[PDB]
């Protein structure tokens, strides 16, 4: 596995020469499994991960500020799973474009500031601010898991979108969304279509629903406070919500 360091200096990039890693004008492209540690400010770019469905990568955000004037700061085209680690004590900021440009205009992905076609896990005790101006904040077509982090999401559309599922087991999470705070869609795959919150401190301000899930919502051992225009929890399936967990944002 690779263990590479990438340092941004506004309009310069200093990267280890390693297998499968390339740097182009507005792109850092990862094609081999391993760990990739990012730091510094990048004026305009995308971290593109395309390593195959049988391989994993860790992106360590070690004090990075990435803006992308055309698209998503992080786009995972393929992976078994990508873990995004928020380094302790570091401030990370990701800012995407108001309107995405799709080089092939028949594409409509990526459609979130952090977008993945595959499982994504966010972890660590560091800080992350996601400024999502186009559509969703953190999105995946499969499973989103957050196990830690001081995470702030500002999204034009949905805050966290995990088509398969969304799991939050830790972290201090602050979501502002123009649609749903947390949204899940999958109707078919066994034991998907759920939102499972088992820890953390969560604040959701949503114009529509705080949590919009298809088959299940479970909340326990967590502090979830919401202020919404729609429902605190919208779910066609089952609700298993421990008392004293879900309340009003003051
Ligand atoms: Ca997939
Ligand atoms: Ca999965
Ligand atoms: Ca909704």
Curated annotation (Swiss-Prot):
**For binding Ca(2+) 2, which residues are annotated in this chain's numbering?**
119, 143
List of residues binding Ca(2+) 1: 117-118, 142
Q: Does the keyword Transmembrane helix apply?
A: no
Task: Name one cellular component (GO) term.
Answer: plasma membrane
How does the entry describe its membrane topology? Lipid-anchor
Location in the cell: Cell membrane
Q: Which keywords does UniProt give here?
A: Calcium, Cell membrane, Lipoprotein, Membrane, Metal-binding, Palmitate, Signal
Polygalacturonic acid-binding as annotated region, ranges: 89-190
* Residues the record lists as binding Ca(2+) 3: 180, 208-209, 212
Q: Name one GO molecular function term.
A: xylan binding
InterPro entries per UniProt: Cthe_2159 (IPR025584)
Which residue ranges run through the membrane? none
| Function of the protein | Binds cellulosic and pectic substrates. Displays no enzyme activity (in vitro).
The record's note on quaternary structure and interaction partners says: Monomer.
Annotated protein name in UniProt: Carbohydrate-binding domain-containing protein Cthe_2159
Q: What is the lineage of its organism?
A: Bacteria, Bacillati, Bacillota, Clostridia, Eubacteriales
